[PDB]
Design a protein around this ligand. Structure first.
Ligand SMILES: Nc1ncnc2c1ncn2[C@@H]1O[C@H](COP(=O)(O)OP(=O)(O)O)[C@@H](O)[C@H]1O
Ligand SMILES: Nc1ncnc2c1ncn2[C@@H]1O[C@H](COP(=O)(O)OP(=O)(O)O)[C@@H](O)[C@H]1O
Lengths: 214, 214
């Protein structure tokens, strides 16, 4: 299964190391951005389903699910939202200019809290506060399952997915956490971050935890 | 306290008797539109509060509250959302052309479900399925409390509010129910309608009920 490679729009590349190369204190904000994005994609499929009810049948349950994979130093965040086709992944996650990218960077220079990233419509890129590599695994009703992958350099890849679990519909954000941000694999830390910043979310937030039988 | 009178945009007046003069079966949909509008106004104040936290201090609790007043044949639906100033009430609730009004009426003629009214951005006017008169009582952080009132004719009034309970911030939709839609004053009916159409709402929905002490 052959990967295709794409270049990021210049300012997005600039943003990603303005982010991956911050001191910044309040790195936990990366999870509120993901949950907020997940909730929007779930909004979209629900809104779409108003006039096309069958769109929901590929995955009738509407949820956000967080799954630590400590052996792999990975945190996953799944939603059963609208998903992205191959062309959406390429268009929406890097090739096309985002309206607020340059404005956000300008605001950051002037002293804005990184927390405002969401208000500039580029909150997706905050994942690079905690992760040096990411896969977005996504299944839209309108396409096959694909994997988009980035290590914050100037190119990303998109590959037809023949290696991951089948998602009915929606997206898995798969974060390869930095060796110093491994706290985010912990059940108590996750819970704490969710209650602080994601209080008004209309969908269940599920946490998957593994325990030894004693 | 002197009322001012305003004329509705022509097509809105047309819509209001296309609605108040329907047979239509599924009139319960009027409550999902109100809850959806309440949730949006709560979204707006929360979104606004991201960069102006003090906006929330006029009413720190974020809620939708439904209160039957059977003696008056009234149903109220309150939210602690962003509210509307006098100028917003005049602009947003009747004087200015809404993008979907004529399109909705055209779709209705072709056989669309009245339920689609929300998708055309004119869902507010569905209240006239069950009510022959309405007051919108509203308090924005940016203005005094005002009352907008309509009986579905071609004019509405706006009055400085010196007669209703003070709301900290937000809106009371006060419906004067038709003599044949009094079922909507009933605790069990309300509950049933809410669970069917308002399952993914991020705010608590509170129901106020009066019971005799036995
Ligand atoms: N979980 C997801 N499901 C579907 N689409 C997504 C998801 N996460 C991000 N996207 C897409 O990426 C775009 C960029 O996300 P982001 O930078 O947070 O900006 P926005 O404010 O538009 O969400 C979104 O508009 C959306 O189309
Ligand atoms: N509870 C409320 N609080 C504040 N504003 C409201 C409320 N209900 C309605 N509005 C205002 O009236 C407008 C018209 O409502 P509606 O016809 O449902 O269309 P929309 O799809 O814009 O909500 C809204 O955009 C909003 O500005």
């Amino acid at each position: 299964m052959a990967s295709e490679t794409f270049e990021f729009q210049a300012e997005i590349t600039q943003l990603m190391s303005l982010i991956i190369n911050t001191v910044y204190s309040n790195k936990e904000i990366f999870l509120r951005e993901i949950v907020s994005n997940a909730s929007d994609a779930l909004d979209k499929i629900r809104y779409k389903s108003l006039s096309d009810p069958k769109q929901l049948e590929t995955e009738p349950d509407l949820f956000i699910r967080i799954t630590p994979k400590p052996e792999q130093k990975v945190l996953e965040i799944r939603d059963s939202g609208i998903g992205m086709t191959k062309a959406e992944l390429i268009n929406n996650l890097g090739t096309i200019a985002k309206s607020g990218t340059k404005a956000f960077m300008e605001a950051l220079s002037a002293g804005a809290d990184v927390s405002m990233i969401g208000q500039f419509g580029v909150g997706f890129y905050s994942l690079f506060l905690v992760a040096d590599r990411v896969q977005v695994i996504s299944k839209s009703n309108d396409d096959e399952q694909y994997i988009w992958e980035s290590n914050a350099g100037g190119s990303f890849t998109v590959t037809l997915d023949e290696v991951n679990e089948r998602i009915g519909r929606g997206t898995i954000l798969r974060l390869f956490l930095k060796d110093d941000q491994l706290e985010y694999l912990e059940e108590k830390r996750i819970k704490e971050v969710i209650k602080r910043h994601s209080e008004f979310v209309a969908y269940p937030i599920q946490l998957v935890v593994t325990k030894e039988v004693e």
